[PDB]
């Protein structure tokens, strides 16, 4: 998503042009691209910056996940031990 937001913003930066029927078709896309971009920003997974969550939190969730990993793997070895036994 963050990548699609970058590529999206990229295409919009490159869009502006001429006037007339064109001027409208060029400004119509710019209006849709602005919607699309705002939706992507909304859908960005809660990283830092409060889009999803701050940084302090992101670090906590990572430590919490690593700990649960160690555990779920201890469970996994036990489950396998027994199956094998």
């Amino acid at each position: 998503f963050i990548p699609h937001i970058f590529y999206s913003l990229h295409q919009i930066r490159k869009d502006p042009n001429n006037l007339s029927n064109q001027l409208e078709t060029l400004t119509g896309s710019i209006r849709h691209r602005l919607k699309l971009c705002k939706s992507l920003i909304s859908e960005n997974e809660d990283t830092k910056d409060l889009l999803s969550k701050s940084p302090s939190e992101w670090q906590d969730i990572i430590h919490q996940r690593e700990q649960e990993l160690q555990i779920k793997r201890d469970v996994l070895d036990d489950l396998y031990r027994k199956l094998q036994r």
């Binding site: 963050i2 990283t47 889009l51 999803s52 992101w58 990993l69 779920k72």
Partner: protein, 91 residues
């Protein structure tokens, strides 16, 4: 402010454009506009970039979580088998 400011700029960007493009009124010389529509775009890009680290941590958290679920899956998968064996043996 990354996200918040990122959302304000987009607003004022569409504003400035709409004026420049004549949807809304603006005086004839109207370069201030064109200049703004470039400062804002640069600000957005800069702001978006500064946001990458945040979205990367998220990328990590997604990995971790995917793993965690996969593992719990394998454990479940084994418990099933035990029960299935138990069936073939009991019922």
């Amino acid at each position: 402010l990354s996200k918040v400011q990122l959302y304000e700029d987009l607003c004022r960007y569409e504003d400035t454009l709409s004026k420049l493009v004549e949807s809304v009124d603006r005086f004839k010389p109207n370069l201030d506009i064109a200049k703004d529509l470039i400062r804002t775009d640069e600000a957005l890009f800069e702001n978006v970039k500064l946001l990458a680290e945040y979205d990367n941590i998220y990328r990590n958290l997604q990995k971790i979580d995917k793993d965690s679920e996969e593992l719990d899956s394998k454990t479940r998968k084994i418990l099933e088998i035990l029960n299935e064996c138990h069936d073939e043996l009991k019922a």
